[PDB]
Amino acid sequence: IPGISLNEDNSHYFYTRAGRRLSAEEVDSWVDQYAGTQVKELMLCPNCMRTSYASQVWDPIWRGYDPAGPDDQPLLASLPPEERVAARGWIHTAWQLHQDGIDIYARWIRRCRQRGISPWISMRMNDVHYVNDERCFLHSEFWRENPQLRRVPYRFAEWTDRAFDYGRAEVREHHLKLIRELAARYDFDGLELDWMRFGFHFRPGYEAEGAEILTAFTAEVRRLLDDWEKRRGHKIHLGARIPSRPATALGLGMDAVTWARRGLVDMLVITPFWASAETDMPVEIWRQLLEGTGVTLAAGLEVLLRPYPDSPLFQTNSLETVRGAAASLLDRGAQRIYLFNYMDSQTAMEDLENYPTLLREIGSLETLAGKPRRHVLTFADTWAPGEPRAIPLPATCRPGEWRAFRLHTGPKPEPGEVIAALGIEGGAIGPETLEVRVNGELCAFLGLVDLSKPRPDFPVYGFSVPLAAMRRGYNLIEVTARQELRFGWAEFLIRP
């Protein structure tokens, strides 16, 4: 019953359908794949620094576009010729829809409502893709002309260094301009402020004043949508993406409990940025923080599943790793599972044959029950400036030393098999090199496990877990090694 909130990004549909002359009929068909599933809400993202629709207050993606011209035109000049082709696909497809008198977002919305989906607009508040290229096609002229409006003038070590500083009146006005336009143009059920594109909105050190500013911003947005409620004659929701732990959220100027208690938002999505889905997020704590506010708390997944920040693997979640994260977060009280980067092609799970199943299963413990699942140890990609970072992997165990890993496996397993699986880096073990316990109980050595992808490029050793040992929620792997070892991977595989 909690269900699925699914984010469709600003660029995907225009990139993947480039070169077909899209009919209103085909545009509508995109909403159909999500109909009759556990999907309750599609969050349709129309923007980055530029809009994918023909905006009158902001730059459409095709501003500067010579549609008859060659790939090497001023708008695309700054990309390598190969990347001009990909980018021109997004730009041209978007442009050609506007010329055909097709407003893709008014169409998708209309169609969502026939097919029993609540349609949302999700706004990227501070996208900074490719800001290392000040000539890039997808930056706004406002950004290009106002370097003084950026977060970090003294260094460029990351893209967020060039993000807009919302400590500026001109920056808030610039994004309130697009919100004012989206509310007037589209009759949506809700607006999602996606603060997590890219998460960083203030001068380093100013995040306190930042919190006050983003609360006063959200209140002004709530007060705008209250006027549209009258003009439309139905409730319009306001929701927000925010980081996965409450110290990080407030430390990045997002005091969400305040937003919540002031009825400024009615939905919050705790999520990582990108680098990996978090399989472990403190939902129980967020629920206590939000008690009596009537906000719906959603646990946000990302498509990547990676063991540690410096890992060279860039594989995505599978149906089994997503039922793993789903089971867990629902168990911990998630009122929605929110999918970001799980689209129908290109940016998507690699086991794309399983997408129809996924959208029919991960929105409920009922439909996850008695299905194979994988609970993988990952990491939080996002931390406030100077905030101590808690990263479990990789983990070194010296001879005679103990290391514990807690993994959230949500509902107590059904009758069947449980494996605790540990990958070892550095090119090794025998059956006794590791002593492994789960919740104190000795686990049998199984041998080398042949994982399905997502999997590491190093040996994964399996240990059979007494079923009785496994608990609701966190389950604790403890290991000791008789040889020095580095762990780069840890998961529970549960096979009812």
Q: Which residues of this protein are in contact with ligand DAN, per CB under 6 A?
A: 9-11, 15, 48, 127, 129, 138, 197, 274, 341, 346-347
Whose Cβ is closer to ligand DAN: residue 13's or residue 487's?
A: 13
Instruction: Kindly identify the residues of this chain, within the stretch 283-342, that bind a second copy according to CB under 8 A.
Output: 284-285, 288-289
Of residues 35-94, which lie at the interface with a second copy (CB under 8 A)? none
DSSP symbols for 113-125: HHTT-EEEEEEES
Binding test (CB under 8 A) with a second copy, winner from 135, 223, 231, 472: 472
Which residues, 6 or more positions from 83, have their beta carbon under 8 angstroms from its beta carbon? none
Q: Is 103 in the site for a second copy (CB under 8 A)?
A: no
Q: Residue 15 binds what, of a second copy, ligand DAN, none (CB under 5 to 8 Å, by partner type)? A: ligand DAN
Question: Per rule CB under 8 A, is residue 464 in the interface with a second copy?
Answer: no
User: Which is closer to a second copy, CB of 103 or CB of 387?
Assistant: 387
When the beta carbons of 87 and 224 are compared against ligand DAN, the nearer one is 87
Considering the rule CB under 8 A, would residue 148 count as an interface residue with a second copy? no
Residue 274: name its binding partner from a second copy, ligand DAN, none (Cβ under 5 to 8 Å by kind): ligand DAN
Element (H, E) at 423: strand 417-425
Shortest spacing between CB 45 and ligand DAN, in angstroms:
8
Contacted entry of a second copy, ligand DAN, none for residue 472, CB cut-off 5 to 8 Å set by kind: a second copy
CB atoms under 10 Å from CB of 411, counted, come to 17
Of 289 and 327, nearer to a second copy (C-beta) is 289
Q: What residues numbered 204-243 form the site for a second copy, per CB under 8 A? A: 204-209
How near is the Cβ of 392 to a second copy at its closest, in Å?
A: 4
Nearest to 458 by CA among 435, 484, 488, 420: 488
CA distance 56 to 185: 10
Shortest Å, Cβ 473 to a second copy: 5
| Binding of a second copy by 385 (CB under 8 A) | yes
Structure tokens belonging to residue 10: 């600003």
Q: 317: which DSSP letter?
A: P
Structure tokens at 447: 């041998």
CB 78 within 8 Å of CB 128: no
In the complex, least distance from residue 363 CB atom to ligand DAN, rounded to whole angstroms: 22
Residue 10 touches which member of ligand DAN, a second copy, none, C-beta under 5-8 Å by kind: ligand DAN
Is there binding between residue 467 and a second copy (CB under 8 A)? Answer: no
Exactly one of 233, 312, 427, 440 binds a second copy (CB under 8 A); which one? 440
Residue 355 to residue 348: CA distance in whole angstroms: 9
Indicate the residue among 18 and 395 with the shorter CB distance to a second copy: 395
Exposure string over 221-258, b if 16+ CB within 10 A, otherwise e? bbebbeebeeeeeeebbbbbbbbbbbebbbbbbbbbbb
Return the one option of a second copy, ligand DAN, none that residue 48 interacts with (CB less than 5 to 8 A, by type).
Answer: ligand DAN
Contact at 8 Å (CB) between 415 and 446?
no
Distance CA 108, CA 100 (A): 16
Which is nearer to a second copy, 278 or 351 (by Cβ)?
278
**Element containing residue 81 per DSSP (H, E):** helix 81-99
- Residue 439 contact partner, candidates a second copy, ligand DAN, none, CB within 5 to 8 A by sort of partner: a second copy
Q: Is 389 in the site for a second copy (CB under 8 A)?
A: yes
Report the alpha-carbon distance of residue 392 to residue 378 in Å, rounded. 8
Short-list 292, 147, 298, 125, CA closest to 217: 125
C-alpha span between 294 and 283 (Å, rounded): 15
Instruction: Work out what residue 107 binds among ligand DAN, a second copy, none; the CB cut-off runs from 5 to 8 Å by kind.
Output: none
The option from a second copy, ligand DAN, none interacting with 74 (CB < 5 to 8 A, set by class) reads none
The 10 Å Cβ neighbour count of residue 66 is: 11
- Using alpha carbons, select from 273, 324, 317, 325 the residue that is nearest to residue 299: 325
Taking the chain, what is the end-to-end CA distance rounded to the nearest angstrom? 22
DSSP code of 164? B
Residue 399: phi and psi, rounded to 5, are -55, 135
Closest residue by Cα to residue 362 from 332, 325, 333, 335: 325
Look at residue 428 and give the partner it binds from a second copy, ligand DAN, none, a contact being a CB closer than 5 to 8 Å depending on partner kind. none
Establish if 448 lies at the interface with a second copy (CB under 8 A). no
The answer to whether 266 touches 296, Cβ cutoff 8 Å, is: yes
CB closer to ligand DAN, 15 vs 217: 15
Answer with the entry of ligand DAN, a second copy, none that 138 interacts with (C-beta below 5 to 8 A by kind).
Answer: ligand DAN
Our CB check for a second copy shows the closer of 351 and 381 to be 381
183 scored as a contact of a second copy (CB under 8 A): no
In sequence order, the β-bridge partners of residue 206 are none
Residue type, 173: E
Residues that bind a second copy (CB under 8 A): 152-155, 157, 203-209, 245-247, 250-251, 257, 282, 284-285, 288-289, 379, 384-392, 401-402, 404-407, 437-440, 442, 469, 471-478, 480
